[PDB]
Amino acid sequence: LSDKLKEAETRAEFAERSVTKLEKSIDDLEDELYAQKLKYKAISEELDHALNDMTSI
Amino acid sequence: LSDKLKEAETRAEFAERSVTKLEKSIDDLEDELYAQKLKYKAISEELDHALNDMTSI
Amino acid sequence: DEDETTALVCDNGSGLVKAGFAGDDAPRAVFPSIVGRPRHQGVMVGMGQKDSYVGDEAQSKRGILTLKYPIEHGIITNWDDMEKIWHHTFYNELRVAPEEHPTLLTEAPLNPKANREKMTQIMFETFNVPAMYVAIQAVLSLYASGRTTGIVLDSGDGVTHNVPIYEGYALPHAIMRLDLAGRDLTDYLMKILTERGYSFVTTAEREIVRDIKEKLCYVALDFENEMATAASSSSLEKSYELPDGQVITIGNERFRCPETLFQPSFIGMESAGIHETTYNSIMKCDIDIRKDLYANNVMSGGTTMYPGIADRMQKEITALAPSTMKIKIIAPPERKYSVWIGGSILASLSTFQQMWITKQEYDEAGPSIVHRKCF
Amino acid sequence: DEDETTALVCDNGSGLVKAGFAGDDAPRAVFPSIVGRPRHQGVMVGMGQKDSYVGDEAQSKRGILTLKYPIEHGIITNWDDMEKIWHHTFYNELRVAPEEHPTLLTEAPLNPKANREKMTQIMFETFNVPAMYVAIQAVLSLYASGRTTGIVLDSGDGVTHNVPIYEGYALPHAIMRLDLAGRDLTDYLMKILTERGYSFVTTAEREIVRDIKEKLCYVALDFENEMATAASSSSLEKSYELPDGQVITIGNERFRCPETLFQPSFIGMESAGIHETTYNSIMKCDIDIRKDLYANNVMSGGTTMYPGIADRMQKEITALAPSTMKIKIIAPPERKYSVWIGGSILASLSTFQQMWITKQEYDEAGPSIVHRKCF
Amino acid sequence: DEDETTALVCDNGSGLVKAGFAGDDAPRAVFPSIVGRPRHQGVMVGMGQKDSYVGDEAQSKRGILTLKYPIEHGIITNWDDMEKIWHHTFYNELRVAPEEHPTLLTEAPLNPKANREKMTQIMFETFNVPAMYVAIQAVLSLYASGRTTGIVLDSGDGVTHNVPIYEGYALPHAIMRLDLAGRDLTDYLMKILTERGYSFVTTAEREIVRDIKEKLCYVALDFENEMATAASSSSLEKSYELPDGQVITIGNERFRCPETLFQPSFIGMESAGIHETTYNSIMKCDIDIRKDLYANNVMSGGTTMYPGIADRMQKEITALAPSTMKIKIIAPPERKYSVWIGGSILASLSTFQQMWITKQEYDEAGPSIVHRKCF
């Protein structure tokens, strides 16, 4: 049990670290998805707004 | 140790669910990012394409 | 799948294969004219893996394949690989077996006879097609475009044939066959990209350069002025993503690739370009033909999709052509697909039902019959 | 319960031997590559006492034995000791005789050919096995891991091989082999634990350090920052119980040992480490085969079980890799044992039943047959 | 130690660098293109010890150095190490000051432009050379070989250029440039020597394999018959003495390394092989060119020194070539030195004096001047 605990603790710590890595990667995806949407629909949708004007004339 | 193990194992398995939840969310955010990237790409390219075709007139 | 014995139509050259049924306005499927083979020793067991890959299969698994084109410079040489392509082209994607359907294939009068003979022979002896016809791609482009008269400058993958037609008649003495095509434009581009630090040698690298060309390159209307700016400023540079994450930045090289069409000396060819050949095909014809051919210069096939090519050609041709006369280019969005479309139109005309080589005529005469019957 | 002539599977390293029968999902037993021999003069008689001890016997009586490992950097040199290990392995724990079963043995792709020839010869001439198959360790991890594609980084006890595989094909020119392994990590740790006041020299001491490493060590993701705190506080120390009840407490040595894999200069080798060798194997592959190897960094063997390694390897390749590309690591629980599992899978494939060298083929050709039939 | 205000010549590539003065028939010396740096921690003090070592210094003290070359497959990337090599070569070995002498440096005509630009720029801006001229290696080969016409196979350490020249004119459309070279042949040999039980990893080990290759390897006239015996009998084996007294015995591997040039798949390269690419350079040229190129297959660079290479190349071409034509290999003693010798000839030709870039012209135009004056 001491080893099972160290192993479970390794797993708990692993999971805390894995969760930490994923806390970081979820935030990176939360920020990257955010940034990509924020820049991508905001720019390309803006480019389609610009289409409204670009294709006028 | 049995109690500490139950907590380390419970915390590990739980945290492992946080690992799979963050991981899953990361994959879903990436699928969304991809879809966002794809739409961005498709729009910028559709416009750039159409614009290249329509640069003239 | 078909409710009538409609002819199958396919434009199959040194580049790509376009196929569908007569009566449609587009090919249903487009494949590269490629048969791929592994160039590596298998290590894992039970991996599937084909001895050969056809068309899109060949490009999809290309990372470890050597990719060959059975057709080069307008002619089929690898008949075995063509049988595999024809099966995939007409049956695997259209689900139509040629055995119950006539087939219409394309070329040009200066395309060596073996091409027309093998196209006709393969479909009759391997696929048992009830009938065959070999068409001039220029004929088909003109049908698709609503014309009987014009010069069809087909600037394709392995050869440019430049075939003049007047009021539905071929004018074969005026065909200008030029050893400059899209495959050479790809070769030029990889050499100039090498000058910038990006060397492309293997099959995968070659296919990538062709992708760079198809999406980034342009002709523009005045290359000296385009170069004066492109050679002086980053504002005309464009990034391309290599499928490994590297980025290649292309500048005046972006138009110097297609510029070869207006400068064949770039690849060692003794020619002034495709507008010179368009001009000469018209010039070689009597003047009462020429006036209508100049007013109807027609773009068909490959490379017609480079930005500025239809307009660059009209400018380059009017610069060679006599004044007063109107010089004009026919270049609809149905470009590059106009040959396939014309095949659909021609195959399905009621008057064309008398133009088909039947299987009985073929079996009696042999493979050379196409030379007696097509054009 | 072996009523069928299932192939036997036995993966033999410088570290451990994993053995069981094909069709299982794990080795039945682990024999730690060892033949032990007494190094002292006996005084009592009628004490039994063997001339040599094998596998777990060598470890159980190790207090007075010198422990010799027959395999150096993945290469069998002491073939006599491997016969002792194989007899014990197959007959005492797996409860089988190779004479009645095909046997699969393994080795790195650039392992000198003499090794695959002897593995084939020994099982046919000493154990009379009806059939043989020497497998690639990289392949076996890919089967176990569900991959056909990826860079397989076998950071085990002997040699790190590092071989890119795509669609089941080897890309051997891109193999980036390193004389960096688990046995160098143990030696390094013995020296840095000496620095702390706990000298380790002899066999019993060497075994302790190996056990300390496996249970206390890790890589983490940032060596310099991990060292900055490990060298400053007891909060990153961990205690280990030595066989005689003494306790050793280890600080930054806990990671400095594992770090050798990323910094081979620690053991005197002119190398940038496993993450650059992994990365270079991707780089050395074709342009259309890199976008798949970046997405498939595949672990094999041991040391892959260090805390922080799955993320550090994905991170290091990502840092070396260009942007846009997706970088991913495959690091399943079938770690430290994926090669054995793959052996079971390969031995059992219906598509692999023709890959076996039969005894008759062996007797006619000799040991060199392994290069004609296996790889 | 030189007695004239002549030009300096230096053929500095990815392997070795040859240098001497214009007007001689040989370089004064050849050095490895290497800058070395310590890979070990010093313990004694007052030991001298440089931060970096160059050429012979880098090789002489290599036991504790990691060695790098500045040129990657013909392209300079480490211009600072080139500076060290050029400084040592001109200042200490040729015993001249570049400030007082014009300098000629070399590169393939299809080599990325940055290479020619840095050679011109560094000699003018860090060495203050009064004049510069980047030369075409193929030109220099023909001038050394006594030809104006032929295919130049410079098959070097970096890249194989393979360019047809006729009557002094380039025929660039026919250059079958290939990324297959001596540096790959060395790495290949290391892997196959590993298969034989002799592992090599480090710089010293790489220098040893390169020395093995240069003294023991050969092409042979017939690869299949040569391996049938070499892989079956000790009669074709040759030993080599390693610097530590160990002996390595090499059989068919002795020729498998050079065989790679004819069989590029040995290193994962997709290529027809140097003899087919040579054949294609001849065939791509016009009918009235081909006859003269068949009779003039011209050697320069390294790898041309393998026994049987001149003869296997002549046999491979005559076997592909048409009858009537006499197919001949030009493989003079000036082998490997053909380019340096040609450099001396070009620099000194009276008809070339106007081709030199002067320092004043350089300072006014900037580094891009190399494309206005050289190529």
Side-chain angles (χ1 to χ4, degrees):
Chain A
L1 291 172
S2 180
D3 290 345
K4 197 184 289 187
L5 176 58
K6 287 182 290 189
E7 291 169 355
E9 182 63 9
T10 297
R11 285 194 289 277
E13 189 180 3
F14 165 76
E16 287 168 352
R17 301 170 277 172
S18 182
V19 168
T20 298
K21 289 174 184 178
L22 297 173
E23 282 172 354
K24 179 64 168 72
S25 294
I26 193 67
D27 289 346
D28 287 342
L29 264 293
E30 299 301 357
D31 290 345
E32 290 171 356
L33 179 58
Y34 171 84
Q36 291 289 71
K37 285 189 288 90
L38 183 60
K39 299 298 185 181
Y40 289 178
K41 292 296 180 62
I43 294 167
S44 289
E45 291 332 323
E46 191 52 49
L47 293 173
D48 284 344
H49 184 170
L51 182 151
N52 194 66
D53 297 308
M54 288 189 281
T55 62
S56 72
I57 306 299
Chain B
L1 291 170
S2 180
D3 287 346
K4 293 290 180 180
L5 181 275
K6 285 182 290 191
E7 291 297 303
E9 187 64 9
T10 298
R11 289 186 297 108
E13 191 67 19
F14 173 77
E16 187 64 15
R17 295 289 81 76
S18 292
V19 172
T20 59
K21 289 175 180 178
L22 288 164
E23 182 179 8
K24 178 64 166 71
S25 295
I26 289 163
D27 287 344
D28 289 344
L29 292 167
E30 181 62 20
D31 286 346
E32 287 294 320
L33 191 151
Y34 172 74
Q36 178 57 57
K37 182 169 69 171
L38 179 60
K39 293 294 182 183
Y40 175 71
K41 176 180 164 63
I43 296 163
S44 293
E45 292 176 0
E46 187 184 0
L47 288 166
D48 290 342
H49 166 72
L51 178 56
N52 288 340
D53 191 56
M54 295 295 107
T55 296
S56 175
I57 310 306
Chain C
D1 295 281
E2 299 292 336
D3 56 347
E4 181 56 290
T5 56
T6 181
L8 299 176
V9 178
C10 183
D11 185 8
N12 188 324
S14 72
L16 294 99
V17 182
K18 298 184 188 77
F21 58 90
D24 204 352
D25 294 318
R28 302 304 297 178
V30 179
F31 312 89
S33 295
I34 298 172
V35 178
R37 292 178 172 84
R39 67 185 178 87
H40 287 267
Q41 172 66 56
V43 77
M44 301 187 74
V45 177
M47 297 292 104
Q49 305 302 313
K50 297 179 180 178
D51 290 343
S52 65
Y53 296 79
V54 180
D56 52 309
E57 292 173 341
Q59 289 181 320
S60 292
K61 301 299 187 186
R62 69 188 180 273
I64 57 169
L65 306 178
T66 179
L67 302 183
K68 305 297 183 188
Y69 292 85
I71 298 169
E72 64 183 10
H73 303 292
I75 181 163
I76 296 167
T77 62
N78 188 334
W79 66 267
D80 184 77
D81 287 348
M82 289 305 298
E83 288 180 352
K84 291 189 284 293
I85 291 169
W86 293 124
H87 183 74
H88 185 65
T89 297
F90 293 119
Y91 183 77
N92 287 341
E93 293 296 312
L94 306 180
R95 314 306 298 175
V96 181
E99 183 177 0
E100 297 182 359
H101 297 264
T103 299
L104 191 153
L105 304 177
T106 63
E107 61 170 30
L110 297 179
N111 190 312
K113 289 188 291 188
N115 190 61
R116 59 178 62 161
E117 291 177 349
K118 296 305 291 185
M119 287 190 293
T120 301
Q121 180 174 50
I122 293 167
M123 294 307 295
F124 281 120
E125 297 183 30
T126 297
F127 296 93
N128 296 311
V129 71
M132 291 292 289
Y133 185 80
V134 177
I136 298 170
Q137 63 82 31
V139 170
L140 301 183
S141 181
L142 288 169
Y143 277 110
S145 293
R147 295 290 184 274
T148 60
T149 300
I151 304 299
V152 180
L153 193 296
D154 56 328
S155 61
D157 185 82
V159 62
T160 299
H161 286 285
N162 195 38
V163 179
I165 298 173
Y166 180 82
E167 294 288 335
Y169 293 82
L171 303 172
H173 71 287
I175 297 168
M176 299 294 108
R177 183 183 180 281
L178 175 67
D179 287 338
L180 174 62
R183 191 179 295 188
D184 296 299
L185 297 179
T186 299
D187 186 73
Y188 178 88
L189 182 60
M190 67 179 72
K191 288 183 172 68
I192 202 167
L193 294 177
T194 299
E195 290 180 354
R196 288 172 68 91
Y198 297 80
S199 171
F200 297 88
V201 177
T202 67
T203 294
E205 290 173 331
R206 171 196 81 211
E207 291 296 304
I208 292 166
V209 174
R210 61 161 304 183
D211 190 60
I212 292 168
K213 181 184 81 189
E214 290 172 8
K215 292 177 170 63
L216 274 71
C217 291
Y218 63 90
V219 177
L221 274 61
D222 183 326
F223 77 94
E224 292 181 355
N225 289 339
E226 189 66 22
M227 196 174 297
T229 299
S232 298
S233 177
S234 66
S235 68
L236 299 181
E237 289 181 336
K238 175 74 178 180
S239 296
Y240 174 89
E241 178 183 347
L242 297 171
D244 63 3
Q246 294 185 90
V247 176
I248 184 166
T249 300
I250 302 173
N252 66 30
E253 301 86 2
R254 192 172 171 200
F255 65 86
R256 291 169 74 186
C257 169
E259 180 174 328
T260 304
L261 293 172
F262 300 94
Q263 296 288 278
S265 67
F266 286 179
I267 60 165
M269 177 64 206
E270 188 181 355
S271 176
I274 62 170
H275 58 294
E276 187 71 21
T277 59
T278 299
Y279 173 79
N280 286 335
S281 291
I282 296 168
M283 181 187 75
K284 293 292 184 181
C285 299
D286 285 353
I287 201 161
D288 290 326
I289 297 172
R290 291 182 185 177
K291 74 185 201 298
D292 296 294
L293 294 173
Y294 279 114
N296 296 278
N297 289 309
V298 179
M299 299 294 103
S300 74
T303 77
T304 62
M305 297 297 179
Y306 273 120
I309 190 64
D311 296 285
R312 168 71 171 278
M313 286 292 282
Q314 187 174 290
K315 184 178 186 295
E316 287 287 6
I317 295 166
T318 193
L320 298 175
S323 66
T324 301
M325 173 178 63
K326 178 67 173 177
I327 293 92
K328 183 173 181 179
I329 292 173
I330 308 303
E334 301 191 342
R335 37 189 197 205
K336 120 201 237 178
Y337 295 93
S338 66
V339 174
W340 185 89
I341 292 165
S344 180
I345 292 167
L346 180 59
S348 66
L349 295 175
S350 67
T351 58
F352 185 74
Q353 301 307 305
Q354 301 302 310
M355 294 294 287
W356 285 99
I357 299 168
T358 66
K359 185 171 189 293
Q360 184 63 39
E361 289 173 313
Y362 177 86
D363 286 343
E364 292 174 2
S368 65
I369 192 167
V370 67
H371 193 68
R372 294 184 181 93
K373 299 292 188 178
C374 67
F375 56 87
Chain D
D1 292 311
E2 290 315 299
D3 44 357
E4 191 46 294
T5 62
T6 188
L8 304 176
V9 179
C10 182
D11 185 25
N12 303 280
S14 292
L16 306 174
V17 179
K18 298 180 289 296
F21 56 87
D24 204 337
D25 294 320
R28 297 305 298 175
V30 177
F31 310 86
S33 296
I34 179 67
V35 178
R37 293 181 172 88
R39 70 183 184 87
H40 296 90
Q41 174 67 55
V43 296
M44 299 184 76
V45 301
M47 296 293 102
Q49 303 303 307
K50 296 177 179 174
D51 55 295
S52 64
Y53 295 81
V54 61
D56 52 302
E57 292 176 342
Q59 291 181 340
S60 293
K61 299 298 188 184
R62 70 186 181 273
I64 58 168
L65 307 178
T66 183
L67 297 183
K68 303 294 186 183
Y69 296 89
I71 298 171
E72 295 182 357
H73 300 292
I75 302 166
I76 298 166
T77 62
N78 189 336
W79 62 267
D80 192 66
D81 286 347
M82 289 307 301
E83 289 178 351
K84 290 179 177 64
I85 292 166
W86 291 340
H87 180 79
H88 176 64
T89 295
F90 292 122
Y91 292 80
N92 292 331
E93 297 296 321
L94 272 56
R95 306 293 174 84
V96 298
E99 184 177 2
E100 297 180 0
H101 299 272
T103 299
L104 186 149
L105 301 176
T106 65
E107 75 158 22
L110 294 173
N111 190 302
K113 68 183 182 181
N115 191 63
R116 65 189 79 172
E117 290 176 350
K118 292 300 294 185
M119 287 190 291
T120 301
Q121 180 174 49
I122 294 165
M123 293 307 297
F124 282 120
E125 297 182 30
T126 297
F127 295 90
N128 296 311
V129 71
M132 288 292 290
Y133 192 70
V134 178
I136 295 169
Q137 291 173 309
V139 168
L140 299 182
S141 183
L142 288 168
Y143 281 117
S145 295
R147 294 291 185 275
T148 64
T149 301
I151 305 300
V152 183
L153 193 291
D154 54 335
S155 54
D157 54 333
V159 63
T160 299
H161 185 79
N162 197 44
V163 54
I165 300 171
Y166 180 86
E167 292 284 338
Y169 289 81
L171 303 172
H173 64 282
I175 294 167
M176 303 296 288
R177 186 183 67 82
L178 300 175
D179 291 330
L180 177 63
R183 289 243 174 250
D184 297 305
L185 288 170
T186 299
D187 183 71
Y188 182 82
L189 185 59
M190 291 170 74
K191 289 181 174 68
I192 65 173
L193 295 177
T194 300
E195 290 176 356
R196 289 175 68 86
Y198 295 79
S199 173
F200 297 90
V201 177
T202 65
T203 292
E205 292 169 354
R206 183 177 66 197
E207 286 289 298
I208 292 167
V209 174
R210 181 178 65 77
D211 191 60
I212 291 168
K213 181 184 75 180
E214 291 175 10
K215 292 179 170 67
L216 274 69
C217 290
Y218 64 92
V219 297
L221 276 63
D222 183 327
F223 176 76
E224 293 77 7
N225 287 339
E226 192 70 21
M227 181 173 66
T229 61
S232 298
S233 178
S234 66
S235 66
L236 279 81
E237 290 183 336
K238 195 79 170 184
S239 297
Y240 176 90
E241 180 182 344
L242 299 171
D244 59 352
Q246 293 185 83
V247 177
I248 184 167
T249 300
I250 301 172
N252 65 12
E253 300 84 1
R254 191 173 174 202
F255 46 96
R256 286 161 61 196
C257 165
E259 185 65 14
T260 303
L261 292 173
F262 294 89
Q263 300 184 55
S265 67
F266 282 16
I267 58 170
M269 182 168 70
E270 164 185 17
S271 174
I274 63 171
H275 58 295
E276 291 192 4
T277 208
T278 298
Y279 173 81
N280 288 342
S281 291
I282 295 168
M283 181 185 74
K284 296 292 186 181
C285 295
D286 192 89
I287 192 166
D288 281 315
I289 311 180
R290 310 161 149 174
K291 79 163 200 314
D292 294 289
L293 296 175
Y294 277 119
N296 295 279
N297 184 356
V298 176
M299 296 295 102
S300 175
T303 76
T304 56
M305 198 64 71
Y306 282 124
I309 195 66
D311 184 1
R312 184 170 179 183
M313 287 297 288
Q314 186 177 289
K315 181 179 177 183
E316 290 289 359
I317 280 48
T318 299
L320 295 168
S323 69
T324 301
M325 292 294 102
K326 186 174 185 176
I327 298 93
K328 184 173 181 178
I329 189 163
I330 297 95
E334 284 83 9
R335 291 193 297 274
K336 150 190 217 180
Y337 294 92
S338 65
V339 173
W340 185 89
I341 293 166
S344 180
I345 293 167
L346 178 60
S348 299
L349 296 175
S350 67
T351 57
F352 184 74
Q353 299 305 305
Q354 301 302 311
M355 291 299 294
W356 285 99
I357 298 167
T358 66
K359 185 171 189 292
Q360 184 63 39
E361 289 171 326
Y362 173 82
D363 285 343
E364 292 174 2
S368 66
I369 193 166
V370 70
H371 191 62
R372 293 169 63 194
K373 298 290 187 177
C374 296
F375 65 93
Chain E
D1 295 347
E2 296 181 5
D3 57 340
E4 182 59 292
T5 58
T6 185
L8 307 176
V9 179
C10 182
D11 188 16
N12 187 338
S14 66
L16 294 99
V17 49
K18 293 179 177 63
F21 60 90
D24 205 336
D25 294 319
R28 286 173 59 81
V30 59
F31 306 99
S33 296
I34 297 292
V35 178
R37 295 181 174 87
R39 71 182 185 87
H40 287 269
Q41 173 66 56
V43 295
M44 299 184 76
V45 300
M47 296 293 103
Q49 303 303 309
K50 297 179 180 177
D51 57 316
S52 62
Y53 295 80
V54 59
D56 287 346
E57 292 174 345
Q59 189 180 56
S60 294
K61 301 299 188 186
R62 68 188 180 274
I64 49 73
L65 305 175
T66 174
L67 305 181
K68 303 291 183 183
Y69 53 89
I71 298 169
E72 299 177 15
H73 299 288
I75 299 96
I76 296 164
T77 60
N78 190 334
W79 70 266
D80 292 281
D81 286 348
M82 291 299 293
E83 183 162 8
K84 290 279 285 189
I85 294 166
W86 284 328
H87 178 73
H88 180 69
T89 297
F90 294 121
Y91 188 74
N92 292 325
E93 299 293 328
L94 272 48
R95 300 179 180 175
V96 297
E99 185 176 2
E100 297 181 359
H101 302 274
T103 299
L104 187 149
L105 302 177
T106 65
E107 88 177 45
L110 297 176
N111 190 299
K113 287 176 175 170
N115 194 68
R116 54 189 72 176
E117 290 174 351
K118 295 305 292 184
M119 288 190 289
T120 302
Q121 180 173 50
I122 299 304
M123 292 306 299
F124 282 119
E125 297 183 29
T126 64
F127 293 99
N128 297 313
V129 71
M132 289 292 290
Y133 194 65
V134 177
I136 297 171
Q137 289 172 310
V139 170
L140 300 184
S141 177
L142 289 170
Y143 291 134
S145 299
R147 296 291 185 275
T148 63
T149 301
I151 308 299
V152 179
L153 277 293
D154 58 342
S155 298
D157 194 83
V159 65
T160 299
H161 191 44
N162 193 25
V163 54
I165 299 172
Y166 181 85
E167 295 286 321
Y169 291 90
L171 302 172
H173 70 286
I175 299 169
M176 298 296 104
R177 188 185 181 281
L178 176 65
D179 292 331
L180 178 62
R183 180 67 60 163
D184 297 303
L185 297 181
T186 300
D187 198 76
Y188 178 78
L189 183 59
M190 291 172 74
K191 289 184 178 66
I192 65 174
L193 294 178
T194 300
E195 289 175 347
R196 286 177 65 88
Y198 294 82
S199 296
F200 297 90
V201 177
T202 67
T203 294
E205 290 171 338
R206 287 179 179 276
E207 288 292 294
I208 293 166
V209 173
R210 181 173 66 81
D211 195 65
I212 291 168
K213 183 182 77 172
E214 291 176 5
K215 292 183 175 72
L216 274 67
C217 290
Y218 69 103
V219 176
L221 299 178
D222 182 327
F223 296 113
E224 292 77 10
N225 287 338
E226 192 72 18
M227 71 181 77
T229 299
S232 298
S233 177
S234 66
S235 67
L236 299 179
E237 290 182 335
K238 175 69 178 175
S239 65
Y240 175 91
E241 295 179 347
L242 298 170
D244 62 353
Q246 293 186 85
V247 178
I248 184 166
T249 300
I250 303 169
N252 55 307
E253 300 86 358
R254 190 176 166 202
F255 69 80
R256 288 176 70 196
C257 172
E259 185 176 6
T260 298
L261 292 171
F262 294 83
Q263 300 293 341
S265 68
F266 282 16
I267 59 168
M269 181 65 197
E270 183 189 354
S271 174
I274 61 169
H275 59 291
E276 183 168 344
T277 59
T278 298
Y279 180 75
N280 286 334
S281 290
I282 295 167
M283 191 61 77
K284 291 291 185 181
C285 298
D286 291 352
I287 293 167
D288 289 319
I289 295 173
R290 305 188 181 148
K291 74 185 200 298
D292 295 290
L293 297 176
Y294 278 119
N296 296 283
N297 184 359
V298 178
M299 289 181 160
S300 64
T303 77
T304 62
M305 296 299 289
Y306 289 124
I309 190 67
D311 297 291
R312 183 67 193 175
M313 288 294 286
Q314 186 174 292
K315 288 179 180 294
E316 287 286 4
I317 299 301
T318 201
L320 298 175
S323 68
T324 301
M325 298 295 102
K326 193 74 176 179
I327 292 85
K328 299 184 284 186
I329 190 72
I330 301 169
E334 287 77 346
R335 291 193 297 274
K336 106 209 241 179
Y337 298 89
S338 293
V339 172
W340 185 90
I341 293 166
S344 180
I345 293 167
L346 181 59
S348 66
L349 291 177
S350 65
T351 59
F352 179 73
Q353 296 305 306
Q354 74 281 2
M355 293 300 293
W356 285 98
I357 297 167
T358 67
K359 185 172 189 293
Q360 184 63 39
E361 290 176 312
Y362 177 86
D363 286 343
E364 292 174 2
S368 66
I369 193 165
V370 69
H371 192 61
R372 292 181 178 87
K373 263 78 154 64
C374 296
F375 60 94

